Amino acid sequence: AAPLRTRVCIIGSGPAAHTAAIYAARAELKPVLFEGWMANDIAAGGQLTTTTDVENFPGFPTGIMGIDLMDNCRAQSVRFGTNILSETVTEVDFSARPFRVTSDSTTVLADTVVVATGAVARRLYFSGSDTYWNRGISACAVCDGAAPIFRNKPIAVIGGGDSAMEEGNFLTKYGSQVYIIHRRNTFRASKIMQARALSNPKIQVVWDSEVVEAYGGAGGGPLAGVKVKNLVTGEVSDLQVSGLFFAIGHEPATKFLNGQLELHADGYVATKPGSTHTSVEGVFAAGDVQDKKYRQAITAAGSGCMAALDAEHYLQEV
Amino acid sequence: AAAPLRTRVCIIGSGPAAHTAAIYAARAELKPVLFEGWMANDIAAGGQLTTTTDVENFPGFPTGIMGIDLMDNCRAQSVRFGTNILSETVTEVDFSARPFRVTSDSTTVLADTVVVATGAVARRLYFSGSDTYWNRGISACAVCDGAAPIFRNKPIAVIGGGDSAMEEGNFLTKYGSQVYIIHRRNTFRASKIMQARALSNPKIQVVWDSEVVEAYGGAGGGPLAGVKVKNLVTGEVSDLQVSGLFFAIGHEPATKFLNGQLELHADGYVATKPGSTHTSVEGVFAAGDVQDKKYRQAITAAGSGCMAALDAEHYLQEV
Ligand SMILES: Cc1cc2nc3c(=O)[nH]c(=O)nc-3n(C[C@H](O)[C@H](O)[C@H](O)COP(=O)(O)OP(=O)(O)OC[C@H]3O[C@@H](n4cnc5c(N)ncnc54)[C@H](O)[C@@H]3O)c2cc1C
Ligand SMILES: Cc1cc2nc3c(=O)[nH]c(=O)nc-3n(C[C@H](O)[C@H](O)[C@H](O)COP(=O)(O)OP(=O)(O)OC[C@H]3O[C@@H](n4cnc5c(N)ncnc54)[C@H](O)[C@@H]3O)c2cc1C
């Protein structure tokens, strides 16, 4: 009954959301941003808070920790007038204008909305997966591959996408042998990507299989092996390995929208290519919630900028 | 769906409780159908024990046994006696009618009795740094990991305000140099006794009205080194050096799927008739951590699963 009214409501708190906030606020639109309260089991600030060392975000010659970069983006958004609610959005209503955005505690009436809730890397929860997390297992092959523990030892990658093919190749630069493990006998990845990996000397595919257990050594040591179950024969085999990486995609954060935006089948928001426009006039989508191809902080930042300008431009025509 | 499995006893869950219930139901020739989940609730079939490495207090194993192996044995045992195990997660039940209807994505079972044994899952927070330093300082099992070298003689933090937080705090002062309980309020939910035994502890310091907003490491990409704590009154944020941080903020009983059809306590646990597995619905039983927040052991949960089988067997005979 006491709804905040704003020209621009931003949902999410990664690089996209914050770049959008910076431009919307500087354009004197007084944006309200919902940064979440551990929304989606990711801290406000977004995926970057789950990594330690960001080296490819332009402007930081020495690199910068994700948490610090995102601390900066938020301080910047606040500095220009962004009103940040530390609340998770649970529901929207895009059938009427102004649009309604609500959390547990707050209700906002917004002339435009930027959806920038991002995505989260997918993992499995087979026996041993929590146990050996950061002690062999990880969901970022590229983050951790170089690391000593894996050098010259065998690595496993689970997945059947383009990501799995490329992370597999990437890992054969550090490991002694790489195993791609996939549930089916056929890859979802492009025919090209399948070939570049299948042609790789240090990669061996393990079709028709699932990992059913990860175990360690010692002495409570780090990851030492995985039990793999063939899904045709039923047979279970030990497979020695110092690393296991998840390359099974990313889960775009769109369930809260309850279907009110047109999505692709993988759940990402369908945008007008080369803009942030969605299926609903006045609602925009920026960042990883609508990009599975690049998935970078820098691209997502760019997209957030675009979402602000698009919204600003849509306000002017209305 | 239109080809429903019919059974005297349908068991939902795959921990010690479910499997002991299966072992008894199957041996009593009741041909139980068990839904072990497909990573239901983001825990492997086998249950919480699959998230630990060394179980030392389950009677019968003088040398200890790894959780995964123990639960591999329970399952092989359930199968050996005829249990039909679906590797599927239950999404919905119907307890308004008999036989009871239990369904997963793929299967529908019509059951004369149901044993709910879906257990629980330790709660955690997802502040910045929490995934990062998981197993590299941060953990949800103070008692599992406290002894470990990394923590010896260094400062530890515990988050929570329950009886568990008080006791895990005390337990940690045996290994650390100093222990900090961190809680959102200025008052503890724990019993007045427990609050006193911790507040009286020399090596424990409480950090009221606070939240952890970040965990950071050292080096060189080293292990947990500190946490940023935010006071919720003043707003101030402070660095607090620490080699370990443990979650003692309770357990989440796996009862949402029941969608209200069993009477729950406010914390979500299934309300059972004390000293049995009887629930608010005749013919439906609850065993294990899904209805026990007090003991929470594999051995007690096993005992309770046995009870659920015999209770159901006894209820079939009177019906
Ligand atoms: C391990 C790892 C390492 C990475 N390293 C790099 C790197 O070195 N360089 C690089 O460029 N990129 C890196 N990335 C990728 C980068 O994190 C993402 O590409 C980028 O963060 C996408 O940002 P986004 O703005 O789309 O939001 P995200 O970072 O995905 O954040 C979305 C945020 O919105 C919040 N939210 C979600 N739902 C709601 C809701 N309903 N209401 C309110 N808030 C909500 C979430 O809590 C989340 O904090 C890495 C990713 C990972 C996982
Ligand atoms: C890290 C850790 C270490 C521990 N170490 C010990 C120890 O050494 N000794 C000890 O006695 N106790 C220990 N415990 C506690 C012990 O594991 C639990 O008390 C015990 O497992 C409770 O078992 P349960 O049978 O009630 O169900 P749980 O083990 O909680 O299992 C429930 C299972 O059912 C499945 N499930 C849930 N919902 C559904 C659904 N809807 N459909 C299908 N399947 C579903 C889940 O996937 C899960 O596998 C430990 C706990 C933890 C977390």
Numbering used by the authors:
A (entry chain A): 6 to 323
B (entry chain B): 5 to 323
Sentences from the paper on this structure:
Here, the first crystal structure of a cereal NTR, HvNTR2 from Hordeum vulgare (barley), is presented, which is also the first structure of a monocot plant NTR. The final model of HvNTR2 contains two molecules in the asymmetric unit, covering residues 6–323 (chain A) and 5–323 (chain B). As in other low-molecular-weight NTRs, HvNTR2 forms a homodimer with each subunit having two domains: the FAD and the NADPH domain. One FAD molecule with well defined electron density and B factors (∼40 Å2) comparable to the surrounding protein is present in each subunit. NADPH did not fit the excess electron density in the expected NADPH-binding pocket. Instead, the density fitted reasonably well to a citrate molecule accidentally present from the crystallization conditions (real-space R factor = 0.7–0.9). The overall structure of HvNTR2 is found to be the same as previously reported for EcNTR and AtNTR-B, but has a different relative orientation of the FAD and NADPH domains which would interfere with NADPH binding as defined by the structure of EcNTR with bound NADP+ or AADP+. However, the relative orientation of the two domains in HvNTR2 is quite different from their orientation in AtNTR-B and other low-molecular-weight NTRs in the FO conformation; the difference in orientation of the NADPH and FAD domains can be described by a 38.2% closure, a 1.0 Å translation and a 24.7° rotational twist. The distance from Cys148 to the nearest reducing nitrogen in the iso­alloxazine rings is increased from the 3.4 Å observed in the structure of AtNTR-B to 5.9 Å, the solvent accessibility of the FAD molecule is increased by 450% and that of the active-site disulfide is increased by 66%. The smaller rotation of 49.8° compared with 65.6° indicates that HvNTR2 is actually closer to the FR conformation than other crystallized NTRs, which have all been in the FO conformation.
Thioredoxins (Trxs) are protein disulfide reductases that regulate the intracellular redox environment and are important for seed germination in plants. Trxs are in turn regulated by NADPH-dependent thioredoxin reductases (NTRs), which provide reducing equivalents to Trx using NADPH to recycle Trxs to the active form. NTRs are members of the family of pyridine nucleotide-disulfide oxidoreductases and contain two Rossmann-type domains that bind FAD and NADPH, respectively. In the NTR-mediated reactivation of Trx, electrons are transferred from NADPH to Trx via a tightly bound FAD and a disulfide bridge.
